[PDB]
Every structure is written in structure tokens, then in C-alpha cells.
Amino acid sequence: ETSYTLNEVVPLKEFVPEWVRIGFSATTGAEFAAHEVLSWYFHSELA
């Protein structure tokens, strides 16, 4: 019950190709931490 939200208008049609791939990345540098994903659900629809 501790939440964070951020909305923003982003016309994805101007920045991204028609067909894309989606995913996660994570990185460490001179400091570190384990970055793990426990599940992923996605749905998209285009009319």
C-alpha cells in the first residue's frame, strides 16, 4: 500500500518503428545489485 505513479503524454507513433520488440534491461557499474523479474504479463491491441 505504498505506491508511485507518473503519467505523461508520449506519441509513440513519432518515436518508435511500426513493428517493435519490448523487454527489460538492467545494469551494474562500479556499484551493484541483483535485478530479477518474477513474472511478466502483456496485452496489446491495434484496431
Partner: protein, 180 residues
């Protein structure tokens, strides 16, 4: 109409519908992108191209996605670098690691990138991050300097559930991170 939908609730060791890049790999029913180790980049992309908009009608797609994730770090002080969900061209490949989070190359805008990302960043990089030094959630389009960020207190070791939704009618992109 065209739809793509999928869920993965428990990650197998032979999770063949993911494309792994860097040192991202699947283990213990978990997807791990980084272990607690210096200088890594791990990425994983769903194997199918998804049709996000179409030039032949001008239609862009609605999508929603959820995931829960853990950042687990030796203590709350020394934690780096971050995590991202990103949309990118069909052939995308890891870009710079460290502060660039595996998706972008510069803090200067480049439309050649064609990547938008929602990042959950834990290390403050003076050149482009919120000057308060806070960990932050942010939206990034073609650059690692977020178009908008929000401060977030990292609860180290705890799962967090995220919902990112896009409404094509308004082009809004919404992100919530919830710890229990």
C-alpha cells in the same frame, strides 16, 4: 484488429520465448538480468515483434503490461544501476551499460534511437538525473535524460508490482509501482 498477449508467471530454465542478451538468463523460476555483480548488462526481449502502430491507417495500439521485480542490494546505500521496460526496433542490441541502463547511449536526444523506456533508476548520475539525488521512476524517449521522473524509495529485497499502460486515444503512458 491485431492482438499479442502472453504471461509468464514462473520463469523456466528453458524459457524459449524470450531472447536473452548480455548476461540475462533465466533461473529458479526467476528471470535474472543482473546478479549482485559489477559491470553487467543483462536484457531479455519477448520473441515476437509486436505491431504498435500502422502507417497504412494511422492507428496506434493500446497495451498494458504488469510485472513484479526485486532489486536486491547489499544495503540501501550502495545500489546501482537500474532496471527498465523499453520498446525498441526489432533488431535492438545492448547499448552502453552503467548509468545508460543497457538501452541508450547519450544524454543528448537522438531520433536514431527509436527506444522509449520506463526506468526505475537507483543511481544518481550527476550528468543527467534529478539533482536531488533521488532514486526515481522515469520515462525516457531516445535519450537517458527522462522526459519526466518521479522520486521512489527503494525497498531493498522486496517485490514490487508494476503496471504500465498506454492509451492510444490520448497517447498517455502511465506507470505505477506498488510495494505491498
Amino acid at each position: 484488429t491485431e492482438t499479442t498477449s502472453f504471461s509468464i508467471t514462473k520463469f523456466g530454465p528453458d524459457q524459449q520465448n524470450l531472447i536473452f542478451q548480455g548476461d540475462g538468463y533465466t533461473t529458479k523460476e526467476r528471470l535474472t538480468l543482473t546478479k549482485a555483480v559489477r559491470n553487467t548488462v543483462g536484457r531479455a526481449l519477448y520473441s515476437s515483434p509486436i505491431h504498435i502502430w500502422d502507417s497504412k491507417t494511422g492507428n496506434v495500439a493500446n497495451f498494458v503490461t504488469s510485472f513484479t521485480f526485486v532489486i536486491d542490494a547489499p544495503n540501501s546505500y550502495n545500489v546501482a544501476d537500474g532496471f527498465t521496460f523499453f520498446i525498441a526496433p526489432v533488431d535492438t542490441k545492448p547499448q552502453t551499460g552503467g548509468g545508460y541502463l543497457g538501452v541508450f547511449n547519450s544524454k543528448d536526444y537522438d531520433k536514431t534511437s527509436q527506444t522509449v523506456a520506463v526506468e526505475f533508476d537507483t543511481f544518481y548520475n550527476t550528468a543527467w538525473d534529478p539533482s536531488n539525488g533521488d532514486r526515481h521512476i522515469g520515462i525516457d524517449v531516445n535519450s537517458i535524460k527522462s522526459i519526466n521522473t518521479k522520486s521512489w524509495a527503494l525497498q531493498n529485497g522486496k517485490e514490487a508490482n508494476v503496471v504500465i499502460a498506454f492509451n492510444a486515444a490520448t497517447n498517455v503512458l502511465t506507470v505505477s509501482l506498488t510495494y505491498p
